[PDB]
Amino acid sequence: MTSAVGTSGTAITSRVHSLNRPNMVSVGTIVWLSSELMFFAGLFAMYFTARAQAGGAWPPEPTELNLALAVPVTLVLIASSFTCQMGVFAAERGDVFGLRRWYVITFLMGLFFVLGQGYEYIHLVEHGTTIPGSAYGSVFYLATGFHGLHVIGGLVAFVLLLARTKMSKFTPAQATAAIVVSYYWHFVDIVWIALFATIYFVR
Amino acid sequence: ELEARRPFPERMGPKGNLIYKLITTTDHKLIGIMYCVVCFAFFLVGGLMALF
Amino acid sequence: MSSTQDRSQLDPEVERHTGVDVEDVPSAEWGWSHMPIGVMHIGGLLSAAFLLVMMRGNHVGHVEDWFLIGFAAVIVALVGRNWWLRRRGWIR
Amino acid sequence: DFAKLAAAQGDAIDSRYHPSAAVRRQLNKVFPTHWSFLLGEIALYSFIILLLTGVWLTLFFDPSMAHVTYDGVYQPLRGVQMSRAYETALDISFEVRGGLFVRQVHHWAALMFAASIMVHLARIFFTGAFRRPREANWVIGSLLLILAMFEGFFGYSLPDDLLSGTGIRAALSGITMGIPVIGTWMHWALFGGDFPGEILIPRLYALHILLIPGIILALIGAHLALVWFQKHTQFPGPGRTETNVVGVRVMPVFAVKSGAFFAMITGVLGLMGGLLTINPIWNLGPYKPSQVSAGSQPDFYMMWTDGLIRLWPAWEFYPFGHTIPQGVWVAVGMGLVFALLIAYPFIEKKVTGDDAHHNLLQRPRDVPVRTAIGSMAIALYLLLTFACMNDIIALKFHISLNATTWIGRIGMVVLPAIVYFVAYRWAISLQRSDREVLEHGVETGIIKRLPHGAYVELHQPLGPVDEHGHPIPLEYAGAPLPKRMNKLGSGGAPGTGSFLFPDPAVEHEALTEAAHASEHKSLTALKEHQDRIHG
Amino acid sequence: MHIEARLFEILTAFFALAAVVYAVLTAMFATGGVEWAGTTALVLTTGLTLITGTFFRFVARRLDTRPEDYEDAEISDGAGELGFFAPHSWWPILISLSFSTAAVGAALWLPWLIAAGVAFVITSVCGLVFEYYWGPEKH
Amino acid sequence: APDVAFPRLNALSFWLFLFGALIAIAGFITPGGAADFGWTAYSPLTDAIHSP
Amino acid sequence: QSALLRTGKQLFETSCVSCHGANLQGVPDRGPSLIGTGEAAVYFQVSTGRMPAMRGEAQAPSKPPHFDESQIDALGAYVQANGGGPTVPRDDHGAVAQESLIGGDVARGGDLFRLNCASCHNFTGKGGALSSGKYAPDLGDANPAQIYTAMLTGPQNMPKFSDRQLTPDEKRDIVAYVRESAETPSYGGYGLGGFGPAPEGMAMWIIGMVAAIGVAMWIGSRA
Amino acid sequence: PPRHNFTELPRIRSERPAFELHYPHMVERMRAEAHVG
Amino acid sequence: LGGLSGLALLLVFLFWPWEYQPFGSEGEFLYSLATPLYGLTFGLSILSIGIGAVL
Ligand SMILES: CC(C)=CCC/C(C)=C\CC/C(C)=C/CC/C(C)=C/CC/C(C)=C/CC/C(C)=C/CC/C(C)=C/CC/C(C)=C/CC/C(C)=C\CC1=C(C)C(=O)c2ccccc2C1=O
Ligand SMILES: CCCCCCCCCCCCCCCC(=O)O[C@H](COC(=O)CCCCCCC[C@@H](C)CCCCCCCCC)COP(=O)(O)O[C@H]1[C@H](O)[C@H](O)[C@H](O)[C@@H](O)[C@@H]1O
Ligand SMILES: CCCCCCCCCCCCCCCC(=O)O[C@H](COC(=O)CCCCCCC[C@@H](C)CCCCCCCCC)COP(=O)(O)O[C@H]1[C@H](O)[C@H](O)[C@H](O)[C@@H](O)[C@@H]1O
Ligand SMILES: CCCCCCCC/C=C\CCCCCCCC(=O)OC[C@H](COP(=O)(O)OCCN)OC(=O)CCCCCCCCCCCCCCC
Ligand code: HEM
């Protein structure tokens, strides 16, 4: 125990030196996100089959999408992605507290998006459309609510990473953790853009 | 000019050396062995169904 | 580095010279570490006997009796294997 | 002038009496700061909450089987014949402000009391806090646990209810009346005659508000006095020996943290009394022998006795013109369970041979046979507890009721053995892990050696390092070892500014340097005290 | 990472071709027009491989030729400090058990066992992630 | 290589396999039994109406 | 009605003749004969969905109905005409009565429920376990007509409560109690299911005890 | 295998590093006949 | 927070629609969470006091 057998100032460090080598955590996160893309592909297939088998009026008469509440939430999610990227820049720097600020506002805006989605869910359920109520209702709820579960998972990842940064000193390991969490958030917002363009505009 | 080896390698090992590894295993080699044993157990379980 | 080594003198009092050894149980001196093998053999045999005896009961069922038979059989097989191996010096 | 008033009151106290020396001894008494030593405090605090809520409940409860039509406020039970006990329990629930909350927090406090007694028993048994000294403390603690079990049994049976009255009819009546030589005589003397005798609930009320709680209070006083004057044992550590107590003094730190823990425990109990529904007696209609539900379970502490009743395989003996019902089997089983629990320390000392005065606990891994036996016993207890719940387990988790019953029957001899073997081997493997850490240092990230492609985990030794790379192995000292550089001085100094914004560099450097100096001072003090004791 | 990126680029080319041809030959020459399930699955597996290949290509252009990618690379060239590979840990089994308790809660429609399995999963994932960051206890 | 990229993750993968596999086998202990529908588990036969 | 009978026959012939043989006689060892079961039995069973049954097991589980109210009525009319038996209640208009089956007295309904229903179901209509793979299901999904018809025709391992045994007024009171107990909010917090001891003990051990142990670990020092 | 799979690594030149390691003489041969097929 | 929650307990206990409400009645929702509010306020108050003391 003279000084240390492992000449490192962090019990946990980057899994490989990322300057010359790929970041293993980033590579794994990217691959897993590419798989989650196929999960959402299955959901999209369900939705598109229902759309094709609909008899012309794809959103049934009882259902009526609320763009007034669907445009603000997607705009807020895009803003959350931008703030998450700013936090990523902070993490690339040594700016622990800048990363914390950016990720906190990102978490707040993601929570606002989740609450807006829940409000639209409540309004839609009140106005007839329901999972058991109709095929459109069910496919729409499956797609958008599985995305909402993914957003909740991203929120959990955000708070968990923030706790990690609180409890241990900022290092390339935590910077990479923030980077991969941001990759997940960007994937979530991209699939939300796809779902918005499909559900609301394309219909 | 000669090596002092055991007459035979250790057969099994001391009591209580594997059980905690399995729970805390992080060596891919041990995990791969756990896969092979567990997967083969399901082969016997699944294979017994075919006999019925 | 921010850790201090520990010095411990616990009062000892069987003297562990017979039974289990540190090579088999590293903390043999620190606490009760040896259960006589006869105890476990007899316990397994009595557990198998109890499982078999539960067949006698007020149940018209038969898969229950067969499950009891199977579990008692595997218990007896384990006890017999252990006893035989220790008799021969842990061979085969 | 609060300071003047305090000084004058201290002078008055020390003039009227002379408690200076005794009070100083109490304040200077050192208590180890291990978390597992607060498990008994949980039970003590839950007991205090139980007393406080029980007084309030007694102010409103009327024990009697005197039949009455409700004519209260709860509409779904109106004009239905019920006992005064049930009627006043309903009155507490509905027609008394906060009465539902008080009774719910009372029942939740009872459940936490039982659970914390069980956890404290596990702690002491597995750490060996009973051998040579404190063995009588363990004995009276076992009596205390039994008394708590039966106290809760009489408590949730106190409001004459369908569920609890069915539980009484099963256990108190059938088991008591099945006992061979004096079973019916005990039944008639407890119930003042047949089962629905008009004195059962008043007798249980006496037993539950005064008699059994009085004995529990006396035994808790004896328990705490024994812990106080037979200084609390401690885990092996740097400066901890069999002839000292390393920890914190009563006055500044221990007292404040114990009071805060009491506050937090009562907060948890109140939160659960509010947010979680316990014993909805209004849903559970008044007791009638002809009515019953499908659940029919006792509280989780008597659930193991009920599970024993369910699982035991209907073995009845019929001597010459007599019957020996299956109730005697479970009665003898409970007797054996309690006898073994009470007499374990003496059984353990007779078996092993250790009567040495033990003040240093032993980690459960360091005693494979005892931790194995405790794991086996906990497995049997869990098996019985879930056997009692097999009805709801079968209902919700789709498993046939016969299958659950026979799973319990077979497991209660198979599962204890499996858990014994697994726990024994697990303890020995924890010892092996400790030894490997001692002889090789903590594990870290892998490094590829320069000349060749060797991979080495780049360990970190915990002791003096030999001239070459490998360290001098240390000797196990009965204390936990750090298996992660995480928990050592490695990557543990985040910017001390705030969650959102930093602080000035001068302040951060001052704070971190002061903290590092304090850690050095503490470690050096422990090291020097250890050297002085062992040299 | 040229070959690593080019593998996914080839997969992207093939999957894009498959998606396009399937979409065309299902819009025309199918009983009910575009299938809308195979088409979407092919499009988004093209997206899977496209994302992976694009990231790999970005990294290949960002990083100089690694010893691993370099033929005639000596072992000493790559010899050095490999990063942190997690040693023994018992959090994975707890995560698996928590997710299994959520899964059985979903199968047997028990909202209470779903709610608890999810709590369980959050706790165990927090434990796994914080395993090597929980600073020394400060007393 | 010395180990897999995420050696705690591959440990989770094995345990997810083991416990995920067990709860599928668990259909047998239920009174109804395991899944009637074949391995393919075609849609109409799998809905709550069929194989409930 | 002629067309109602014809529709019931057409649904029967392509739904259940494989296990309730044509002519309504039961297929030996696949299904019982439906002669005498009546319209109430058909309504309850098919509406709860148990009858499009795709396995012979300990108990036929509930499931989404395979027929809409009109087809349920068609099948019930067909079975009633073939066999003749109990009929589902109906309101003034003609639809299956739902609110009319809510008996006025709830204390009487609860007493009757405890004497007869709680025996196996629960204190408040949650489920209960039975001998070999069977179970009394939760009543919170059943609507008043379903509860009334369940009593009227003992579906499976359930005693058959005739009108003579439980006058329709008593059955209406029991229905009122069932619906009231199902729709009534838990006073005092979250009723953990409806079973007291077991859900309460689990919630103690998981919520209160983990909180206490975690707080103790926070306050104290590992060693 | 030792924990971490290796105390050494041979010169990696082809798809058979261990064959080259154990039979150095074949190294030239494995290249000479490779293209003949 | 402990003090504010204690004051909340006091105010809720003194002024809240307690008392049983028969069924499906206006005020049944308030009654259903009357007792939960008592427990929430009380437990939160004393728990926050304990957390402050521990800190
Ligand atoms: C609707 C309705 C009726 C609602 C109310 C519900 C009801 C009926 C009752 C509950 C209501 C109440 C009154 C709740 C609060 C209960 C209560 C007294 C909580 C106190 C906790 C609190 C407020 C702490 C504030 C924070 C703070 C500054 C703490 C430091 C100062 C304090 C309070 C120190 C208290 C120390 C303490 C717990 C003394 C307990 C005395 C007893 C019985 C034993 C002492 C003792 C202890 C505590 C050991 O641990 C121990 C361990 C080993 C050997 C011996 C001992 C020993 O003798
Ligand atoms: C605490 C739990 C751990 C227990 C540990 C002990 C392990 C040993 C388990 C022993 C299993 C015994 C199973 C046999 C039991 C038996 O004899 O009953 C039978 C039913 O067979 C079965 O399914 C057998 C199922 C066996 C699966 C056991 C699964 C073990 C699980 C529980 C382990 C997970 C534990 C989770 C731990 C949680 C930890 C909590 C912290 C028949 O009933 P029945 O249904 O009436 O069948 C009639 C026909 O017979 C008749 O022809 C026909 O006519 C019909 O009438 C038909 O009904
Ligand atoms: C940590 C402290 C916090 C404690 C939790 C406190 C939660 C407070 C909730 C809000 C205030 C009280 C609401 C009372 C209103 C209310 O009661 O809540 C039911 C919901 O009920 C459910 O389903 C459960 C839904 C899932 C969410 C709650 C799960 C919490 C569990 C996990 C807590 C215990 C811990 C156990 C750990 C388990 C793991 C063990 C290893 C909702 O109605 P419903 O759903 O329709 O009930 C059906 C009648 O209708 C119908 O007739 C009747 O027949 C029934 O079917 C009935 O369910
Ligand atoms: C690897 C083994 C592989 C064994 C695999 C066999 C699986 C086949 C089982 C059931 C198939 C469905 C039939 C279902 C009906 C049953 C057949 C029958 O009728 O067989 C005649 C009598 C009962 O007559 P009963 O009329 O049912 O009436 C009775 C009262 N009234 O039983 C007998 O003698 C013959 C015994 C019949 C089954 C007993 C099987 C139980 C468990 C075996 C061992 C468990 C081992 C555990 C190890 C730890
Ligand atoms: C010593 C440990 C004690 C335990 C484990 C315990 C347990 C219980 C339990 C579980 C109940 C059922 C509450 C309900 O169903 O709502 C109960 C009821 C009751 N307890 Fe205790 N109790 C204890 C001490 C006391 C004390 C000291 C008193 C009096 C000061 C008391 C007075 C009462 C009363 C009057 C009832 C009836 C309340 C009702 O019917 O709702 N208890 N007890």
Between CA C23 and CA C16 the distance in angstroms is: 13
Measured between CA atoms, the residue of chain D closest to residue C55 is: D313
């009070």: which residue's tokens?
Answer: D23
List Cβ neighbours of G86 (8 Å cut-off, separation of 6 or more).
G37, G38, G39, G40, G41, G149, G152, G153
User: Beta strand D276-277 with G190-191: parallel, antiparallel or unpaired?
Assistant: parallel
Q: Which of E99, E86, E129, F12 is nearest to A156 (CA)?
A: E129
Token reading at D251:
């006055």
Between CA E38 and CA A41 the distance in angstroms is: 10
Ligand found nearest the CA of G138: 3
No. of helices (H) and no. of strands (E), chain B: 2, 0
Between CA A29 and CA A37 the distance in angstroms is: 12
The atom number, within ligand 1, closest to the CA of D227 reads 54
B24, E86: Cβ pair inside 8 Å? no
Say if D95 is an interface residue toward chain E (CB within 8 Å).
no
């707080």: which residue's tokens?
Answer: G215
Residue D323 lies in a domain: yes
Delimit the domains of chain E by residue range.
Answer: 1-139
The pick from D25, D52, D264 for probing ligand 1's pocket by mutation, whose C-beta has the most ligand atoms within 8 angstroms, reads D52
DSSP collapsed to 3 states, G15-56: CCCCCCCCCCCCCCCCCCCCCCCHHHHHHHHHHHCCCCCCCC
Token reading at D232:
């609390």
The reply, when asked if residue D279 is annotated as ligand binding, is: yes
Helix/strand/coil for G1:
coil
Say if H4 is an interface residue toward chain F (CB within 8 Å).
yes
Beta-ladder partners of D199: none
Where helices occur in chain E by DSSP H, the ranges are 2-27, 38-62, 75-78, 91-107, 111-130
| CA distance to D162, D281, D304, D388, G129, per residue, from D167 (Å) | 9, 14, 13, 12, 18
**How distant is the alpha carbon of residue D326 from its chain centre?**
31
E strands, D447-532, are 447-448, 455-456
Query: DSSP code of G63?
Result: -
Residue E104 near ligand 3, beta carbon < 6 Å: no
Fold for A24-200, please state it.
Four Helix Bundle (Hemerythrin (Met), subunit A) (1.20.120)
Q: Which residues of C47-65 are buried (b: 16+ CB within 10 A; e: fewer)?
A: bbebbbebbeeebeeeebb
Q: How far separated are the first and last CA of chain H, in Å rounded?
A: 35
**How distant is the alpha carbon of residue E61 from its chain centre?**
22
List Cβ neighbours of D188 (8 Å cut-off, separation of 6 or more).
D194
Mutate to test the interface with D, among H5, H7, H11, H12 (most CBs of D within 10 A): H7
Q: What is the dihedral of CA D193, D197, D200, D201, to 10 degrees?
A: -170
Between CA D494 and CA A101 the distance in angstroms is: 15
The reply, when asked if residue D223 is annotated as ligand binding, is: yes
Q: Are G112 and G178 in contact (CB under 8 A)?
A: no
- What is the number of alpha carbons within 13 Å of residue D233 lying toward its C-beta? 25
Radius of gyration (C-alpha) of chain C in whole angstroms: 21
| CA distance to D62, D89, E23, per residue, from D285 (Å) | 17, 12, 66
Token reading at G38:
């009546």
> What's the maximum distance between 2 C-alpha atoms anywhere in chain B?
61
Query: DSSP code of G191?
Result: E
| CA distance to B52, D166, D180, D326, D339, per residue, from D176 (Å) | 50, 15, 9, 11, 19
CB contacts of A2 in chain D (<8 Å) are 465
Q: Are E5 and A17 in contact (CB under 8 A)?
A: no
Q: Which of G196, B6, F48, C31 is nearest to D362 (CA)?
A: C31
Helices D99-127 + D135-157 axis angle, to 10: 150
Q: Are A61 and A134 in contact (CB under 8 A)?
A: no
List Cβ neighbours of D114 (8 Å cut-off, separation of 6 or more).
D148, D149, D152, D299, D300, D301
Domain with residue D65: its CATH number is 1.20.810.10
DSSP collapsed to 3 states, chain A: CCCCCCCCCCCCCCCCCCCCCCCHHHHHHHHHHHHHHHHHHHHHHHHHHHHHHCCCCCCCCCCCCCHHHHHHHHHHHHHHHHHHHHHHHHHHCCCHHHHHHHHHHHHHHHHHHHHHHHHHHHHHHHCCCCCCCCHHHHHHHHHHHHHHHHHHHHHHHHHHHHHHHHHCCCCHHHHHHHHHHHHHHHHHHHHHHHHHHHHHHHC
Helices D401-440 + D368-388 axis angle, to 10: 160
List Cβ neighbours of H2 (8 Å cut-off, separation of 6 or more).
none
Q: Are D173 and D326 in contact (CB under 8 A)?
A: no
Fill in the amino acid letter for A200.
Y
Query: What distance in angstroms lies between residue A173's CA and the mean position of ligand 5's atoms?
Result: 54
Query: DSSP code of G188?
Result: T
Mutate to test the interface with G, among D162, D392, D393, D487 (most CBs of G within 10 A): D392
């007779």: which residue's tokens?
Answer: D350
Between CA D457 and CA D447 the distance in angstroms is: 6
Q: Which of D304, D311, D310, D313 is nearest to D334 (CA)?
A: D304
Q: What is the resolution of this structure in A?
A: 3.0
Between CA D515 and CA A63 the distance in angstroms is: 62
User: Beta strand D455-456 with D447-448: parallel, antiparallel or unpaired?
Assistant: antiparallel
The atom number, within ligand 2, closest to the CA of D405 reads 15
Q: Which of D278, A86, C77 is nearest to G191 (CA)?
A: D278
Contacts 24+ apart (CB under 8 A), E45-49: E45/A38, E45/A41, E45/E15, E45/E19, E46/E12, E46/E15, E46/E16, E46/E18, E46/E19, E47/A34, E47/A37, E47/A41, E48/A34, E48/A35, E48/A37, E48/A38, E48/A41, E49/A34, E49/E8, E49/E11, E49/E12, E49/E15
Between CA D509 and CA D517 the distance in angstroms is: 12
| Touch between chain B and chain I: 3 or more Cβ pairs under 8 Å | no
CA angle D471, D474, D476 (to 5 degrees): 150
Helix/strand/coil for D317:
strand
| CA distance to D263, D320, E120, E127, G83, per residue, from G210 (Å) | 16, 54, 12, 15, 60
Query: DSSP code of G137?
Result: P
Say if E82 is an interface residue toward chain H (CB within 8 Å).
no
Query: DSSP code of G152?
Result: H
List Cβ neighbours of A62 (8 Å cut-off, separation of 6 or more).
A127, A128, A129, A133, A134
- Which residue range is the domain that position D107 belongs to? 2-430
């609909």: which residue's tokens?
Answer: A54
CB contacts of D466 in chain A (<8 Å) are none
Token reading at B11:
């057969």
Between CA G51 and CA E68 the distance in angstroms is: 65
Q: DSSP string covering D199-257, please?
A: THHHHHHHIIIIIHHHHHHHHHHHHHHHHHHS---B---SS--TT---SEEIIIIIHHH
E strands, D397-469, are 447-448, 455-456
Query: What distance in angstroms lies between residue G192's CA and the mean position of ligand 3's atoms?
Result: 5
Token reading at D190:
């407890």
Helices A135-167 + A172-196 axis angle, to 10: 160
> What's the maximum distance between 2 C-alpha atoms anywhere in chain D?
94
| CA distance to C77, C79, D347, per residue, from C41 (Å) | 11, 6, 20
List Cβ neighbours of D150 (8 Å cut-off, separation of 6 or more).
D212
Residue D480 lies in a domain: no
Q: Are F9 and F17 in contact (CB under 8 A)?
A: no
Q: What is the dihedral of CA H21, H23, H29, H31, to 10 degrees?
A: -10
Q: Which of E137, D427, C3 is nearest to G222 (CA)?
A: E137
Helices D99-127 + D84-94 axis angle, to 10: 100
The number of distinct structural domains making up chain D is 1
Token reading at G141:
């999904």
Backbone angles phi, psi at D448, to 5 degrees: -95, 120
Q: Which of A143, A130, A151, A137 is nearest to A45 (CA)?
A: A143
Query: What distance in angstroms lies between residue G157's CA and the mean position of ligand 2's atoms?
Result: 22
Q: Which residues of F41-51 are buried (b: 16+ CB within 10 A; e: fewer)?
A: eeeeeeeebbb
Length of chain H (residues)? 37
Q: Are G133 and G55 in contact (CB under 8 A)?
A: no
Delimit the domains of chain A by residue range.
Answer: 24-200
Token reading at D49:
């909450």
Fill in the amino acid letter for D82.
M
Between CA D116 and CA D42 the distance in angstroms is: 6
Compare CB distances from C14 to D352, D476, D526 and report the shortest one's residue. D352
List Cβ neighbours of D13 (8 Å cut-off, separation of 6 or more).
D19
The pick from D100, D276, D283 for probing ligand 3's pocket by mutation, whose C-beta has the most ligand atoms within 8 angstroms, reads D276
Contacts 24+ apart (CB under 8 A), A167-170: A167/D494, A167/E130, A167/E133, A167/E134, A167/E135, A168/A10, A168/A12, A168/D491, A168/D492, A168/D494, A168/E133, A168/E134, A168/E135, A169/A10, A169/D491, A169/D492, A169/D493, A169/D494, A169/D495, A170/A94, A170/A96, A170/A99, A170/D494, A170/D495
Q: Which of G68, G71, G65 is nearest to G6 (CA)?
A: G71
Q: How far separated are the first and last CA of chain E, in Å rounded?
A: 48
Q: Is D491 left (phi over 0), alpha (psi -120 to 50) or beta?
A: left
Token reading at E64:
């100089």
Helix/strand/coil for I47:
helix
Helix/strand/coil for G136:
strand
The reply, when asked if residue G51 is annotated as ligand binding, is: yes
Beta-ladder partners of D30: D249
**How distant is the alpha carbon of residue A145 from its chain centre?**
12
- For residue B19, the surrounding DSSP H or E stretch is helix B19-24
Query: What distance in angstroms lies between residue G138's CA and the mean position of ligand 3's atoms?
Result: 15
Between CA D153 and CA D84 the distance in angstroms is: 19
Q: Which of D279, D343, D308, D282 is nearest to D125 (CA)?
A: D343
Between CA F24 and CA F21 the distance in angstroms is: 5
Beta-ladder partners of D447: D456
Q: Which of D70, D30, D60 is nearest to D286 (CA)?
A: D70
Query: DSSP code of D30?
Result: E
Helix/strand/coil for F25:
helix
